[PDB]
Design a binder for these strands. Structure first.
Ligand SMILES: [Zn+2]
Lengths: 94, 49, 364, 61
RNA sequence: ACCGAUAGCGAACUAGUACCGUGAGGGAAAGCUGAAAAGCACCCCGGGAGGGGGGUGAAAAGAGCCUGAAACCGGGCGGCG
RNA sequence: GUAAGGUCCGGUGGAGCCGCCGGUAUCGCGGAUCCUGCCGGGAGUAGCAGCGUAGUCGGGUGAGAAUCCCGACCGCCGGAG
RNA sequence: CCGACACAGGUGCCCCUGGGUGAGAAGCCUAAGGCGUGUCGGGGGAAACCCGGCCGAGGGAACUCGGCAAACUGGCCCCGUAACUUCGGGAGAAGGGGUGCCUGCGGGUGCGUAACCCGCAGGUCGCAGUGACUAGGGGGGCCCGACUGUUUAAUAAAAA
RNA sequence: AAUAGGCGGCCGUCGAGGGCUCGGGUAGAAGACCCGGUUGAUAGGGCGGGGAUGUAAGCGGGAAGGGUCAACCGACCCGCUUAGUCCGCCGCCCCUAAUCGCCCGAG
């Protein structure tokens, strides 16, 4: 697992969803897939995706997201409002 | 607090389209507080708009 | 007069519903005098082709011919049960069934991971993935008493049939771990002989070489590839409607006359296609190979696995069968085979044909 | 035609406008008379005994 | 010896009104707290609307207000299932 | 009570009502593809596509944000949007 | 605004239009300006079937009332062009060849080595050079009406 | 199959067995079905195998010619280069996620 204040490199396989959605929804579907993949693999309750990562996904238009995306995931803990502790994963490019 | 009046007046003052107006995303409270053309000119001079 | 034509599709395979179980059932067995288990089981691997000197009667006899074949991986089965059948009022009724007690498993491909020793698997652990309720405190002595009681019933004569309960071993070929439990009949005319045949191999492993003969005809039973819901054009092969039809072209025009005032069951309609229990007759067993290898002329041995491996399948590592033609089912599907129940009058000789070339090129 | 598309051509000058005499919007602006009281066409009011509107005005029917 | 709010004039009432048609012209629906507002002070919850306590009244008749039928809907009970 | 119906008992209701004799009448409803008002099944279903398929990320406001606001990216019209 | 409507109609497209390609106010891309309100969103090998679109081996109308629909051709330059005829036409009849990019010259108007247009020689790449976009298929008989035009707004556009 | 079946095993007079949730398809309109779930190679990732196109960017050289016949420009060609890119196929490696939790259940 990843503890607070730690940094990992992930390779999200965005190509797993290209054929299950219409060609013009692929970029938002890829954003959703990246967020869900990061949350599942980092056990994070919240995921914050960098605008640089969003722009990289949207680089070639709404129809052609990259097949594979290399991302940098840093895990931090907030523990706000007392509702247990919350894990927030920050996603940056490369 | 929608900045439609501010955007329209800034575009009219600067003689450009409303889509060419850039408002600082960190000074939204100042932009909302600005309610007169004098205040909008002051913000333009300061660089928020 | 009107125009006649045969009806669209066959009514002999109705209802066209999903198969009751993914494991095929065998309703009929061939009549044989030799005391041997009447069939085998395996997993479908893939298809390839060979060139062989034809030996079957016909025009192309003695000439080298192309032949498509299917490779079926058949790791040895585990014989672990014996069942007895008496004659009931309306048919056979099982009287008793005895299974062997638990034994250590040695063919399990255990692997050393970081920490912990070998898992040291035993039987009744892989079988638990199928039965889930196995005997507790079962001992060899109790098994012997049960077998003796079954034998005594056979001597008394209340038993009219005996069958062998076997289980597959997919863990040997690393396909999966949950086994398939099947029931197989034994040829012969003596219940005592069949009982001795099963008893001598209870708790043991049976290989396809000890059961089937190369070059003989077989019946292949499996569940076909599923296609989901399909319309009548594909399901029953109806004709497309006229191209000017404004309500659609892939549908039946009239679904019945005024009278009877009901839709007859014979009118084609959309529904489930594929995943049906089917039986194929008279498929020749070209060859039997051991350990994923086939010998050709006592000095050449080749790997039946094509370059890059079979598509959607791993590498063949155990005993395998070469079946002429195609068989129903998908890749990795469980396939059952039995000796042919209605062979032709002039059958091919019971021996491996002369093979001149086997294709092992990439199939992807 | 003759229907919805026809009704879109009602953006011209209205046929009738308010009348200075009777106060109703019935004054034929192009011709120059009132279709209700006859203003601009007669000195006397336009009353017809087959009509009940002038009686309705004063609840006298 | 007329009717008693689908009746009686169309209108018991902000009715020849609202509203329809370019225009002649056509034209509704809509009455009732209580003797007295005494029209619910204060507390808990809810973002609010409101809900629960507690008060007024002979009686909530609580303004969505005299009685509250039938059709319809939800729950409880008896019988079948 | 053959019956059209009458009368009592329990409950709600808060101000009028009935027996008999003799008159009188807009005097008795299941239908008129009857009229007016209210309410069911269809149904939590169709529709919210087609002619211009447009949103995503970070931040803000607010009890509450796919839909409101700012920035970036990606798009549409561009002899007309 | 009118059509009962935040109606894909009509009124008003009534007046005006930067750059490239291009004959072009064409199509396509793009600047300015505008918009994400031609306003319900999310999921999916999640089917059958329907609507709109692309492709299809061999045959090539055997389909059908009927080649309905679809398909072929397509811009420009140069050769070439029939019956008939009212001598004007038919006619872009039919049919054939070429078309990109690079290097360098010549010509017309021009003071100009400014701008536009027209040729020549050589080199070279691909299946394909009007490579996208734009963009006729053609011919021969017969009936009717000479032609352009008008008509049953809402089943008939015609020989009326 | 209303004569609504037979047999082996486990459970009851806390509890066998099962469902939701998890990773994926031998399956699929919703349901259902099938494999795997640390008793682990299910998916991702890394490496390797097999395949599909067809020899990448960059650099060096040549190139019909031009150019002060210099510098330099130049479509295109040759070498590094069976290259580069990609894979809804396979094999090996527990590095990551298959976790936690909730519910029904005969007596
Ligand atoms: Zn007047």
């Amino acid at each position: 697992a990843i503890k607070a204040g730690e940094e990992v490199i992930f390779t999200v396989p965005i190509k797993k969803i290209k054929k299950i959605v219409p060609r013009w929804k692929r970029a938002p579907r890829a954003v959703k897939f990246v967020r869900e993949f990061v949350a599942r693999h980092a056990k994070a309750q919240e995921v914050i995706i960098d605008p640089k990562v969003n722009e990289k996904i949207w680089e070639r238009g709404i129809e052609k997201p990259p097949s594979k995306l290399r991302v940098k995931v840093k895990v931090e803990e907030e523990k706000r409002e007392g509702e247990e502790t919350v894990r927030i994963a920050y996603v940056t490019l490369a | 607090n929608t900045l439609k009046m501010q955007r329209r007046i800034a575009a009219e003052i600067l003689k450009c389209g409303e889509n060419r107006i850039w408002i600082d995303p960190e000074r939204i409270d100042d932009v909302a507080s600005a309610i007169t053309r004098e205040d909008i000119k002051r913000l333009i001079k300061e660089g928020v708009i | 007069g009107k125009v006649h034509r045969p009806r669209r599709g066959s009514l002999g395979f109705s209802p066209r519903k999903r198969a009751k179980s993914i494991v095929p059932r065998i309703r009929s067995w061939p009549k044989e005098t030799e005391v041997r288990m009447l069939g085998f089981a395996g997993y479908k691997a893939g298809m390839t082709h060979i060139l062989m000197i034809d030996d079957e009667p016909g025009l192309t006899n003695g000439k080298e011919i192309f032949m498509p074949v299917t490779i079926i991986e058949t790791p040895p089965l585990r014989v672990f049960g014996i069942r007895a059948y008496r004659m009931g009022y309306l048919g056979l009724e099982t009287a008793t069934e005895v299974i062997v007690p638990d034994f250590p498993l040695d063919n399990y491909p255990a692997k050393e991971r970081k920490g912990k020793p070998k898992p040291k698997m035993t039987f009744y652990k892989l079988l638990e993935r199928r039965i889930a309720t196995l005997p507790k405190n079962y001992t060899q002595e109790m098994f012997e008493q049960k077998l003796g009681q079954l034998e005594d019933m056979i001597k008394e004569g209340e038993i009219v049939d005996v069958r062998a309960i076997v289980a597959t071993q997919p863990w040997v070929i690393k396909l999966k771990k949950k086994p398939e439990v099947m029931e197989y009949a034994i040829g012969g005319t003596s219940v005592e002989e069949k009982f001795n045949y099963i008893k001598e191999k209870l708790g043991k492993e049976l290989r396809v070489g000890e059961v089937l003969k190369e070059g003989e005809l077989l019946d292949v039973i499996a569940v076909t590839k599923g296609k989901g819901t399909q319309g009548p054009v594909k399901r029953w092969g109806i004709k497309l409607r006229a191209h000017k039809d404004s309500k659609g072209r892939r549908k039946v025009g009239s679904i019945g006359p005024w009278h009877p005032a009901r839709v007859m069951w014979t009118v084609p309609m959309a529904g489930q296609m594929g995943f049906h229990h089917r039986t194929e007759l008279n498929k020749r067993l070209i060859a039997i190979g051991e350990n994923g290898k086939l010998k050709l002329d006592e000095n050449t041995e080749i790997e039946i696995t094509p370059k890059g491996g079979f598509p959607h399948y791993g590498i063949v590592r155990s005993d395998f069968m070469m079946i002429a033609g195609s068989v129903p089912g998908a890749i990795k599907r469980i396939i059952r085979v039995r000796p042919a129940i209605r062979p032709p009058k002039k059958k091919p000789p019971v021996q491996r044909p002369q093979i001149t070339y086997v294709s092992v090129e990439s199939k992807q | 035609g003759s229907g919805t598309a026809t009704f879109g051509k009602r953006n011209s000058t209205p046929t009738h406008i308010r009348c200075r005499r009777c106060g109703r919007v019935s004054y034929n602006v192009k011709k120059g008379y009132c279709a209700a009281c006859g203003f601009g066409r007669s000195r006397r009011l336009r009353k017809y005994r087959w009509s009940k509107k002038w009686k309705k005005k004063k609840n006298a029917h």
